[PDB]
Design a protein around this ligand. Structure first.
Ligand SMILES: NCCCN(CCc1ccccc1)CC(=O)N(CCc1ccc(S(N)(=O)=O)cc1)Cc1ccco1
Ligand SMILES: [Zn+2]
Length: 257
């Protein structure tokens, strides 16, 4: 159905998902000179000590590392958020070359990739209910630039050969997502949407200012994945990012001066 090619990519999504042209779509460009410091914003609380990763899945658009979200084990709170949001999965968006790949941009700069740690508001009971609410999800976004290797990413990189094609999964227990964070939790925040269909306007976005560095070899392995299923013509999983969407009547707030 939808995808990232010329015939089914982001410019086509509105025909099946008319919210694609909505009032709070993501991603957006973060204009750093226009984002206002909000001293009312609290420090983020990232509590991943008890995270329970389970499985890694190639879903035909990215790969997801899935977590046990049946209890409050890995949660995001504070910052702009009211209440408690449970980690359900993380995934990335990346490019065919290092000069593109991120979904959010910073003063129009594109990073090589972007990590999304996806959390749902426990007041709605399950993820499917949460996505129907304007405050249902919180996605923590982290930019990736190419330079030195990220040691905490290597366990992900090394399993990708086992999930090359759409629909393949592999056991992925005991992975610590704290190894994917940068040092600083300074962030920008704004109300937005899922960046893939169904594009629901249910996300509080929290985008960290500090990128993580990954090595060229690490991102090259991302680019060896396939959008296609096994025994189908090979289409490399690259450029699985949606471009920036109109900001409309929204303000991006900064946690830092
Ligand atoms: N059983 C198959 C799992 C598929 N799940 C169902 C999970 C579920 C849990 C409890 C109750 C019902 C369903 C749907 C799902 O995960 N999607 C991807 C969601 C998603 C998340 C982050 C981003 S992003 N890039 O913005 O971070 C973009 C999209 C599609 C979707 C559908 C509706 C909203 O989304
Ligand atoms: Zn995403």
């Amino acid at each position: 159905h939808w995808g990232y090619g010329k015939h089914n990519g982001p410019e086509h999504w509105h025909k099946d998902f008319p919210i694609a042209k909505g009032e709070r779509q993501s991603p957006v460009d973060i204009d750093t000179h226009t984002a206002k410091y909000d001293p009312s914003l609290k420090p983020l609380s990232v509590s991943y000590d008890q995270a329970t990763s389970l499985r890694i899945l190639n879903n035909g658009h990215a790969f997801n590392v899935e977590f046990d979200d049946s209890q409050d084990k890995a949660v995001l709170k504070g910052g702009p958020l009211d209440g408690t949001y449970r980690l359900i999965q993380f995934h990335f968006h990346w490019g065919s070359l290092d000069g593109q790949g991120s979904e959010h941009t910073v003063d129009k700069k594109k990073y090589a990739a972007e990590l999304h740690l996806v959390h749902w508001n426990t007041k709605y009971g399950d993820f499917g209910k949460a996505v129907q609410q304007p405050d249902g999800l919180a996605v923590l976004g982290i930019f990736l630039k190419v330079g030195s290797a990220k040691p905490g990413l290597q366990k992900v990189v090394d399993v990708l050969d086992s999930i090359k094609t759409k629909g393949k999964s592999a056991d992925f227990t005991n992975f610590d997502p704290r190894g994917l964070l940068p040092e600083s939790l300074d962030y920008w925040t704004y109300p937005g949407s899922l960046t893939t269909p169904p594009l629901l306007e249910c996300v509080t976005w929290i985008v960290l200012k500090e990128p993580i560095s990954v090595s060229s070899e690490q991102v090259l392995k991302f680019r060896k994945l396939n959008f296609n299923g096994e025994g189908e013509p090979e289409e490399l999983m690259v450029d699985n990012w949606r471009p920036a969407q109109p900001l409309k009547n929204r303000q991006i707030k900064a946690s830092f001066k």
